[PDB]
Amino acid sequence: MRKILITGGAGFIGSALVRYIINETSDAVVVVDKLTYAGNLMSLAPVAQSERFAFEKVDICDRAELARVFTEHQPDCVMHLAAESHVDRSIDGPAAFIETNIVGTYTLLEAARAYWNALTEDKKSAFRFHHISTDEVYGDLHSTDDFFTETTPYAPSSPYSASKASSDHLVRAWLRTYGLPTLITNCSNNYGPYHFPEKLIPLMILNALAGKSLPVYGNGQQIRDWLYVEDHARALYCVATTGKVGETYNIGGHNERKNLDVVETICELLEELAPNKPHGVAHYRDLITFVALRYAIDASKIARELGCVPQETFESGMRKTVQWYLANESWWKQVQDGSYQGER
Amino acid sequence: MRKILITGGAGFIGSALVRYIINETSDAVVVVDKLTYAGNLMSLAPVAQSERFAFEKVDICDRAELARVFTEHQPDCVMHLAAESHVDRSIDGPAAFIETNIVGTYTLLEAARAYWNALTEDKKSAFRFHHISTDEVYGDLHSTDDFFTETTPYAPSSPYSASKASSDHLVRAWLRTYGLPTLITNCSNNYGPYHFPEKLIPLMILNALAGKSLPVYGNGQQIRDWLYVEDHARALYCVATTGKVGETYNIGGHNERKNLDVVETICELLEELAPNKPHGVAHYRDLITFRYAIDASKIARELGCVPQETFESGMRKTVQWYLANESWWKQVQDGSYQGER
Ligand SMILES: NC(=O)c1ccc[n+]([C@@H]2O[C@H](COP(=O)([O-])OP(=O)(O)OC[C@H]3O[C@@H](n4cnc5c(N)ncnc54)[C@H](O)[C@@H]3O)[C@@H](O)[C@H]2O)c1
């Protein structure tokens, strides 16, 4: 029984990983999540009553609390997903994205290093530190036939991605300097169940259901690779448990879809699944408003080496996602309510 | 006349830049240095009396103080050389290298943003944020014919290089994101005047003058490009005043020299400049016991800024300096330098 420590385990992706591990594995988990606006205990509820489940409300920047957790749970592995996507003001000190993403990764690295360093030769060679990053570190694509590979130079363009790139550099340097067994995975845009209402996909669905404008910028021609949450979760576990130390692996949905395609799809699916439309709406597609870049990943390394390929298609994943929303209204509503935060 | 704000101005490279500006330009400076072990006010003494000189003992991590400095001095340009080279453990909070190198670059970027955002359009466009980095961000070279170019992919191998790479990222992102006019320079290993005694080149000189062993490790065949501090300073001012927003420029000595070379060169130089050998020392050489190159064509091509000295030329000047400035290095070794003006 593997004990896995997962940071940001109460977030979108992290929660999916947790549900997977408990539902489709015999392993155990320890969730480390400070519970920001982004965290949601309701997404964990499904597997919260499990014996192999443990939760620690800790801040990755709290070295002491961190050491404790490591001491108490003795994880065999760490999967680092905790991160801040908001870029707040700098008027009162360093923003959270700098602290969490860069400072917090450093702290976690040091806390693990300490732990690892005191492990028996046996537990020592087996330990693994898995860092989750983003494909935004690769910057921009300068062609229509180029893809992001694990060897694309870094060229982060936003504070947030610059923040993530830094974390990656740190993770890589600990291994090379101190020998800490680290690995990294970069992924594309994820979508799926338990995705926050204000996000793109979920937003569209919900607005449509509400009979609200479906804002689409530019030509709506921006292309993205969409990776289904569940598929992401599966690949993470794979990389962790079988992935090779010092290696990086990109993880993608194996697709390229334009933004308009995304909205159309949702509309098309809604017509079928949500026949009865909002007041004074002929067709959902009537809501698409034009209030006017390509990003695609090459996940062949992982497929080749680890043999783990996505199980869904844009189409199958989208359908599932739309059904989820219609089925799990209590969730999204609680989140919109804000009442989710105050949950136990 | 431009008012340039230089962070780390009391450091090795920084002090050489300050001296150059005062001595060979008509511009003014505002030095921002917290004065850690690496800082030395004495390296600034020679020009400290100019009315074009200003010093602010401020930590780049202090948002309030930075705000005060920008507001009070109103620089036209920012040259950011402050960094922490020491990597130490830290059981509570981030270590200094993290705090200063990364968090501090962010702090400075935000303080500059706030300031520039309020400048008049004309001043706004003329504003420059020049960031100094290191060629260690590039990582390792795989051949013996390959050089580091501005476009080589980043692959920082150490905590420090990692911290520098991170800083580079933030600088680039600020431009792309907020429009802050930033530019970057990466350089190789510097040597020259006012270099700390504990350092390699300076160490070699002093140990030799003191009849101590000149430890040549390996076969002493590690290759490195050496850049003369003064040449570095002139290039930085050039980039900063005539460089292109959003570009990156590598700065090198235009050489490749093996460790033994260095050492031998020093000995050979002392034998001529320091004829008066130590006690029981016939020849300096007998003291001796037992790939990183940069491509700086861009800057030379576009900016036209090329190194003025040769390894030879440079080293000669370096030794002479050491011979001529015992007060300095001694006060460093003393520790008395930390209590200067
Ligand atoms: N969502 C995507 O499309 C996506 C794409 C590429 C890469 N990634 C990466 O995957 C990870 C998961 O992303 P996500 O959307 O699931 O994030 P998320 O925002 O949904 O969840 C982040 C979780 O981390 C927690 N957290 C924040 N700072 C913390 C701190 N200091 N200490 C402890 N916990 C803290 C929050 O409470 C939250 O539950 C992130 O590292 C992200 O960079 C995400």
Ligand SMILES: NC(=O)c1ccc[n+]([C@@H]2O[C@H](COP(=O)([O-])OP(=O)(O)OC[C@H]3O[C@@H](n4cnc5c(N)ncnc54)[C@H](O)[C@@H]3O)[C@@H](O)[C@H]2O)c1
């Ligand atoms: N020296 C080299 O060979 C070299 C090579 C490549 C790149 N660089 C770059 O050149 C720049 C200067 O290097 P150096 O060797 O001259 O440095 P240094 O170590 O000699 O000087 C550092 C200076 O920064 C000041 N400083 C440090 N922390 C500070 C903080 N938080 N707030 C304010 N001031 C602070 C110190 O007081 C000191 O005066 C750096 O950014 C470095 O990465 C140096």
